[PDB]
Symmetry: C4
Subunit: 246 residues, 4 copies
């Protein structure tokens, strides 16, 4: 039935979660992170604003492929961190391990720039996303992740509602970034929980999948809704259900 | 009826500016007396704005929209959080209580208000800023800061008025700004040595500001002419010196 | 004869020099400055580039009277330094001295903003200029000032020649800032010389006046020339003549 | 005749890049081997440029005109000054001598040249940058930096070439840049352990770069296709490994 079509996004959710755990492991074999303070989400957010400000001044300052380059470089590096973490727990400190990861990341990034197969895109998007998920999740603990999640969710629903209301007014009364990015969002709580086969934080994983269910449901219905609050609110739901478990 | 309204707005900000002073010094800390403090202050504002605008000229759609929302949220954190949870207080479920409070408010402010809501919130924030600086030091750097600021206003008004005799948001910002300016002599003189019906010379300043704004609103309806700050700013100054020459 | 007309600019030269000396005095009674290194001119120049970059991003970001304000504030402060230095050597550390200078500078700056008498402008321009002259001149020593002067002069002649040649090509083959600023330029060597009634650095003062003579001469002739090299080259000429003296 | 000219330009830059190495380490100092050095390097370039352009978008008339003139003057100071006065040397009238030298040159470069003048100067500067980095560390971070940089080029060429198969200043800059790229394996392998006709494997790299650029110029006249860096960059790399497998 409606299996093969549009299961790929919950697929991507589960996968990213999986790869985030498996990456929880090697990334501490060389540290990484960035104190389970509730101020940590605030630093996160402001810094996110800086990430965008930089990115925008870069785009408006392009840079026909200078923009492509600066991001290409950013990519190259983040993949170095991915791979790096892999071999460095794997073959460990060996020259053949490190060089293994540099060649790996060169290969991958070059590929992505060479008009790949663009199922490939989904795959790398999954990699990257899992990477980030693992990092902040390894970085500090739930209650802070929980605050962060609920905050970001609130911003979102404000954002959709504003522009939706702005649709309903104006008569008479690159998407992948936001996407895969939100693929990441509920998963970071999944890491920073197994960081605090798996726990009762499978619960967070399933609840996040169920949030995604409500989401692709309303999206496959007429007259869309917000996003984060289904995914985060559902991951938090599952997670808190996995407390009522043990 | 709003003819009482805008003085009310002031009176309230002043009251709420004082109430926050106690819990405000549960940390507080911005800027000794030192009159270089007003200068550092000015340059801080000018550089702040210059940066803030280049954020617009480099922004500022969903960016500076959100960016302001964030700054707003933080400032509301300090207001709710620090000023009420320490006023409980302090910690634990109270602190969480105010996170809930400030997210509730900034989210509410965003989206669409209803008259009084925005007035209330502006008043609150204003009281916050007022309290902080009035605390962050004494009534003499404040006296100078005030006369400086006011004199700038009257002059830019005349220049740009005289710059006429030829031939939305920044408004609420500047409004709030005027709600703030006299309140600092009120907090910072409360940081001074008398105490009648709770600090007499600070009362003097307070009424002096309420009458200053009155005179301004009269001339505002007289037509065009109003040197912005110099009524209430300079007049609350007059009132303060009046309530101080008493004790 | 041609006295009263266009002697006012050499007038302004002598005056600024005079006021720069008289200010050499009080400004050390509270220090100021900024090492007689030849790297000092380079720091100067780069920093000058920063002064302009700031000023330009400010103008292009105006600021109808925000621009007016930011500069008004800058002015207010530099006059505080002028006056401040005055009373603080004068009445010294007294409250009445300091408050004297704040009221003084408020008065002056407010005046300048109130459409003054605009001979007044020349006068304040003279004040300011002398102020700056005194500061860098008190700051470090001749050979560095000498390098700085010759450098700046070279930039200038390049600049005029470029745009002049650009005039001669395009057929078929606020001024006060640059002005009073150059009023300042040769005088800083006049300070940093009496800092290293006056010396044989009267020589630098007269030679600078004579440079100005060549300058207002060619300017009052058809087909203009560069500027700095007459003024600086002439001040340096007089100065080096005041070495062949003692 | 310039058919020999552009290889000459390279050959010279390489020579002049080496000559400067000795006096260059009379201070020098930019960036241990460490391959993070190439990464730090890239990010340095990207952030450098991004800033440099926002200087244009915020400039850049008489500003960035002069600003470049200044940067140029400084870099010429280090070339003349440090590389010749310490090579005298060092100090006193020699140092002054080079101030005179570099002001003379940058002023000369500004205003209008004449063919060879700009070529000469570009070559000089290039040798400077080449020398510094080749010194600022060893032939392995350099190997990686090189293959990274080159691979980026071939890919942006194909993308923007393939971005075609639908339907002035930066040129000299990028040119100079290519004059630079292979010379760093030449300096930095001279910073390595053989010494025939003065460092044999560094010779190998050097000829390998001279033939690489040759192959590039052949295809450039073959029509359109030239993956910028990968000929000489990747080829000088081949040559270096060839002259190294010798001793």
């Amino acid at each position: 039935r409606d299996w093969l079509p549009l299961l790929g996004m919950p697929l991507m959710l589960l996968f990213v979660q999986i790869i985030a755990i498996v990456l929880v492991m090697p990334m501490q074999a060389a540290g990484l992170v960035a104190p389970s303070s509730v101020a940590n989400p605030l630093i996160f957010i402001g810094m996110l604003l800086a990430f965008t400000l930089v990115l925008l001044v870069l785009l408006r300052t392009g840079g026909r492929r200078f923009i492509a380059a600066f991001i290409g470089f950013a990519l190259f590096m983040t993949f170095l961190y991915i791979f790096g973490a892999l071999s460095l727990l794997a073959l460990g400190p060996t020259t053949a391990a490190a060089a293994g990861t540099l060649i790996g990341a060169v290969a991958v990034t070059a590929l992505l720039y060479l008009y790949p197969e663009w199922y490939v895109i989904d795959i790398l998007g999954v990699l990257i996303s899992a990477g980030v998920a693992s990092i902040f999740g390894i970085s500090l603990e739930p209650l802070p992740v929980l605050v962060l999640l609920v905050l970001l969710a609130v911003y979102d629903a404000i954002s959709v509602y504003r522009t939706k209301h702005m649709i309903t007014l104006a008569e008479g009364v690159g998407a992948f970034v936001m996407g895969m990015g939100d693929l990441i969002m509920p998963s970071i709580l999944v890491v920073s929980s197994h960081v605090f086969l798996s726990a009762p934080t499978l619960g967070a994983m399933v609840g996040s999948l169920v949030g995604l269910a409500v989401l692709l449901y309303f999206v496959n219905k007429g007259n869309p809704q917000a996003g984060l609050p289904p995914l985060n609110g559902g991951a938090i739901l599952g997670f808190l259900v996995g407390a009522a478990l043990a």
